[PDB]
Design a protein around this motif. Sequence first.
Motif, mmCIF file in Angstrom:
data_model
loop_
_atom_site.group_PDB
_atom_site.id
_atom_site.type_symbol
_atom_site.label_atom_id
_atom_site.label_comp_id
_atom_site.label_asym_id
_atom_site.label_seq_id
_atom_site.Cartn_x
_atom_site.Cartn_y
_atom_site.Cartn_z
ATOM 1 N N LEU A 163 0.828 -1.209 0.000
ATOM 2 C CA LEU A 163 0.000 0.000 0.000
ATOM 3 C C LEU A 163 0.862 1.258 0.000
ATOM 4 O O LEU A 163 2.029 1.217 0.391
ATOM 5 C CB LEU A 163 -0.901 0.019 1.233
ATOM 6 N N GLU A 164 0.287 2.377 -0.436
ATOM 7 C CA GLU A 164 1.024 3.637 -0.445
ATOM 8 C C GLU A 164 1.509 3.931 0.966
ATOM 9 O O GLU A 164 2.648 4.345 1.167
ATOM 10 C CB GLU A 164 0.135 4.792 -0.925
ATOM 11 N N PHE A 212 -3.904 -4.043 -5.796
ATOM 12 C CA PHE A 212 -3.481 -2.892 -4.994
ATOM 13 C C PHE A 212 -2.669 -3.197 -3.729
ATOM 14 O O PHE A 212 -1.714 -2.485 -3.426
ATOM 15 C CB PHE A 212 -4.699 -2.040 -4.618
ATOM 16 N N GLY A 228 -3.721 1.088 -13.617
ATOM 17 C CA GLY A 228 -3.969 1.294 -12.204
ATOM 18 C C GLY A 228 -5.130 0.471 -11.680
ATOM 19 O O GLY A 228 -5.808 0.875 -10.733
ATOM 20 N N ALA A 255 0.251 -1.234 -5.235
ATOM 21 C CA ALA A 255 -0.177 0.166 -5.162
ATOM 22 C C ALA A 255 0.965 1.159 -4.949
ATOM 23 O O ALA A 255 0.969 2.234 -5.536
ATOM 24 C CB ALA A 255 -1.217 0.335 -4.063
ATOM 25 N N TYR A 295 -8.525 0.645 -7.175
ATOM 26 C CA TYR A 295 -7.621 1.315 -8.108
ATOM 27 C C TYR A 295 -6.354 1.791 -7.410
ATOM 28 O O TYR A 295 -6.334 1.997 -6.199
ATOM 29 C CB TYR A 295 -8.296 2.535 -8.751
ATOM 30 N N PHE A 296 -5.291 1.960 -8.181
ATOM 31 C CA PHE A 296 -4.037 2.445 -7.629
ATOM 32 C C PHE A 296 -3.310 3.279 -8.676
ATOM 33 O O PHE A 296 -3.675 3.272 -9.853
ATOM 34 C CB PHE A 296 -3.167 1.281 -7.122
ATOM 35 N N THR A 297 -2.295 4.016 -8.245
ATOM 36 C CA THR A 297 -1.557 4.873 -9.158
ATOM 37 C C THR A 297 -1.008 4.137 -10.375
ATOM 38 O O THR A 297 -0.423 3.056 -10.262
ATOM 39 C CB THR A 297 -0.389 5.564 -8.447
#
Length: 263
Positions: free
Chosen positions: A43-44, A74, A104, A78, A118-120
């Motif tokens: 994760l971010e 993700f 993403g 992510a 969704y992710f970058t």
Amino acid sequence: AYPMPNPFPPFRIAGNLYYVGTDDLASYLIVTPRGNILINSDLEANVPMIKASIKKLGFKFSDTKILLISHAHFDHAAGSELIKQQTKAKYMVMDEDVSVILSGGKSDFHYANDSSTYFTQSTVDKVLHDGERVELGGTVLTAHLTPGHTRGCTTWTMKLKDHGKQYQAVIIGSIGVNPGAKLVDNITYPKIAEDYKHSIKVLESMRCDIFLGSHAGMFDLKNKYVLLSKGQNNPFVDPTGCKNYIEQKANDFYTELKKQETG
Ligand SMILES: [Cl-]
Ligand SMILES: [Zn+2]
Ligand SMILES: [Zn+2]
């Protein structure tokens, strides 16, 4: 909402393979004389944790030359764009999962319409294929395509030397069936069931000494770490647990298939 993982103490698993993940999402650092390889960006919110773990072990985050992932979801990929921006690491992904990474998650055969997944977006520096190797400073990782969970789910393997002995490390990408995944007459991913079965065939005949995975719970991270602290002969060398886990998940797949086909 995906439960935020708790920090976990980083440590050496065997040879030049270190654990730099959380108490859930698992990440790995392979250290070589020509730089390091990082597996799973999670994760971010986990990127700072991964950087911190790498540094705690005495290594440089700036030495991350290659970034890999278990599969395109993700919780495992992510944080890749952040790591690329912060280290300039080369991003390598299995061909079948490239589309999801570039979009993403918008092209995900199952979650395409769930924005919470969704992710970058990020670019793939090198597209990988089944059996292709990733080499750096003499260390050789092999990407095994074990599809189903995701079109390009990758099971990473490598040989580690520990206490004078040789062991095959296997980072199981995942062959779990996510709630809701359609196994029969899947509109967007027709070969989904065929892929899972292939993965079961591959995994069940794969040498596995050092049992690892994309999730800590897969291989009993917590209890093995405790045994490691107690100074036990590498508790991560667990061929029996690996065999049993693979068989268990293989059977879990057939239980879900049975449910979808006759329930
Ligand atoms: Cl599991
Ligand atoms: Zn997944
Ligand atoms: Zn996962």
